[PDB]
């Protein structure tokens, strides 16, 4: 119903600097800082109160929806050391210490990459702080020795001055780091004095330098939460992109266009010639957010250039980090290859290079269980990434994608890896499922009835007097092609018109093939168009377009012409007439653009038709590859012409062309045994 | 000057039923008819007076510009028998009789086909009528015996009832015929009671049946000439077609458009589903007038169908007469093959059959002196028919044709064969030469100066910084291509614009080839367009079209695309902008037609470009023939789209496309060694 939509809208108008689950680990360090003015106790007890409030039934601390030793142990350690250092509420320390001691051994049995960032860097400092309290603690553990060895390895791996000159990710986790400067390192924080926007690093920093720039930041965050802090703040750009991405993939973006373009222009104003980070001011930038923003901004008529990607290339390779070549995960390259589809022909080839590198890197590991990310856990990655690597941009239909994603969006059941298991709900909410699924279900139920309506219409016209193989399957497929490009209820007019004239042209093409052609013509077929229920105004235009199509049928005879582009042009003209829209006065650029679009459509149709023709003759595949490249070029070109926010022509008028061409390419790029499958899944196979 | 034009216009508004040289032979028979009311003398003495007035210095009768025995003798015979039968002015009979007697022998030395119609049929009756007067006459002559033998041959060749039932040409010359009926033959005259619209046959007919329908006809003709009659009357359709044909070929038709379309709609109203004759009411119809009218009517947006030609086909042959298969002359098949060019693709193949039959029949006899007609004598047929058989419709430029015809139109120095040497001046006048030649000469002198203007412009721009082989010849050829499609002085704007942007695109294409392509791009060439002198309004549109062409240049790279259709589309757009015209509101049919034209142009350009490419590689000629057929089909189609008088779009907007495509085909269908020849002949080689 609507209430979900309205709540989501109002919550979406209220985009703050961030919405993430409040962490406890960092709060514990916040408690460790005393009162500034030589006070008697800690700086802020609100954190303390928050801590006492949320003692687990097993005394632990952390998200209950999951169970992770490496994180529970650190949360418990930080809490117990904080409260007992300040020597208060010792009973809770006792309550948790039993679980601590009895769980001390489970750590040796963890997963491969489920290893928190600097996890082996804080834990040493953790037990160090502990040995001042020095309770009963089995410090004796080979796991401790292993992480110690890795500590020494990475310490021998890191420089001193490059570390003191070049701002790197290590500044995110510097508290477990020692043996440092405070002036050469002083300037390597963010615009707000935060080091990598992480509160723990800055808190430990202020512990050794009273720069008010850190105090004001922390005070603001603790004064905006009143007990509790996250592990990273803020995440404006991150959530901004990641919400609109879902709302596009969830097929509900039809309603929130205003707020959508609001966050869009925000990102645009904050766009850099160098890349993007989770926040506006973080100097170090990564590739994944950059690519995602690139894709989304292009997809809405914003002029950007992709040579910014020339920073994440590594001399014939690509690595998500700028300066670090570590084995990347699936998601960054996934979004990269995705954004690598909408290439405009006037752009540098770095996009193509990244595309081929990415597809190579992905297809191999696809067959195995390599879909495990190092920094997030979702419901089902493999299916999504597989379909993505399967159905290119030119063969993508919106409804089938949203249907597939309806079982691949996890909602709340996800977690995000950081220094602690955190989760965001602003865009990982679950009411999104209710809204989208209700919408899709009613949409299905509407398509179901209009289907039978069209069925009885088609039977009334006795069109099978010159039918095909069987009218049922083909009429189903035809109406499905229309329904898949337009799902809004208020356009069933254009929907049914499309389907009807499609069936018509099919029938007459069949009849013409069966008799040989227009030399064997006998009947007045320019009246056959009347079989469509006509309005008062929509009559004459259609008959004119129909006679035009017939004249084309005449002229295309005796030659080696194809007969498809004619049909596509007829289709777009008719869809427009049914949409009841005109063009304006027609300054020369306007009709120039129009004719350009039409010529592109006709050419593409002829080309891929001939390709299919050769495909059926067992032709040598190299020819198929040649023709595929050929259609690809003008495909990209047409897309660029449709996606220009500077166009003088209307928008819907543009996307119509896309609808038709995508329909044709799709139906020309799959066996029916998949088409019917998709058909039943989207129509008859019901949700909820 | 203008006075010639105005006189020709006023004379052309006054189209009568016919304008032909007055004959004397038929007048003589008119004199032979007595007064109807049992009068004392002949019916009309005005003929007699006319006769006495025009006694030749040698007493003979006939056109002095020529000397033909077979006709002079018959004229003299008819005159002397008439005047002396009525026994008046005998001295003139004596004056002519000496030449008669001394010339009696020259007849045995005539030409092959220079044999008047029924010449051997009237002469027997002539000497028969003479032997009543029976003066000194050497009736003894072997030539008389030869024509007598042929008389008997043809008399044994002709039927009786078919002759009495089927109206045939013999009804034109029936006076030398005897042994006849007067009722079964009675109905075989024209609508006006005239037999084949010839006065002699009808006069001899009334001699044996006093049908007033003949008396009124003859009275009208003698009352409209007041002394003297032709050998055939009237010739409305004949002269109507034959004048506008010249005015089209003479390149002056620009001025008389009104009267032109007046006679056109006249012919249209009088158009039959069966064919045409010299006049409106003659039931027997021939092929030559039919084909000529067909061609001219189609060439002005009139919808006619050519199955009317299925009457003149003879089971795999064609013969000008319907029912008679006699060895045809050059002219009828010449005009037939000519009209056989503008074939619309939706038509029956009778046109193609006639085309191949005609070209076969013509090309052989071309090499010999077979250009002699049996019924007319012109200045130079061979050159004209040769050029026609050489340069097809798709390779025809108007100016070169009018220049060639300026030395192939004889004017008055021609004669027309009938029962007597007759001549028409309404369309064979000579002031037409003065007007056309003056026009062409001033046109030449204007082109000469604008040439130097463009020369100094092209030098000012230093365009040769990236030139070609040599700028002179190529710039000449380019400007020539423009000047040859537009000769009106008031369009030098479009002329120079065309030439300038042509030179531009040539230069940039050269530069792009020389550096490899747009990957090696260095300069901002979308500013290079500024080098043209721009107006206030014509600036922005051109820069837009130019950047469009550049984007095309970008997209067409790395593929097997051609780069010609882009240039042609740029050219037409620019010519239109310079012409300063828009399209209207743009109802869907309008822009539909527009885009159709543009797509056709692009396709044709690509195709013939690739053809030329293969041509230079010594490719197997069969491929060239295949590609030639391929371009031919869409060539015909495009022509049909341009020549539709039902179009919603403007006319000039249409013919522009034709101009461009014809330019391209022509330049792609001749060695330069002919191009430069034509160039000098039309520009530097001066008329008068």
Residue numbers in the entry:
A (entry chain A), B (entry chain B): 80 to 767
Paper quotes:
To elucidate the oligomer states and the interaction mode of OsCyc1, we determined the cryo-EM structure of OsCyc1 and finally solved three OsCyc1 structures in dimer, tetramer and hexamer forms, at a resolution of 7.9 Å, 3.5 Å and 3.7 Å, respectively. The tetramer is composed of two dimers that consist of chains A/B and chains C/D. The tetramer molecules correspond to subunits A/B/C/D in the hexamer. When we analyzed the particle numbers in the cryo-EM map reconstruction, we found that the tetramer is the predominant form of OsCyc1 and is equivalent to chains A/B/C/D in the crystal structure. In the particle picking process of Cryo-EM structure determination, tetrameric assemblies are the major particles that are picked. Combined with the cryo-EM structure results, these findings imply that the major oligomeric form of OsCyc1 in solution (as used in our experiments) is tetrameric. Apart from the dimer interface, intermolecular interactions also occur between chain B and chain C, chain A and chain C, and chain B and chain D. Interactions between chain B and C are mainly located on helix α22 and involve residues S620 and D615. In chain A, β domain residues in or near α13 and α14, such as E340, R348 and Y381, interact with α domain residues of chain C in or near α19, such as R535, R539 and E543, which are identical to the interactions between chain B and chain D. Considering the results of our size exclusion chromatography and the static light scattering experiments, we hypothesized that S674A/E677A disrupts the oligomeric state of wild-type OsCyc1. Together, these results imply that the tetramer is not essential for enzyme activity in vitro.
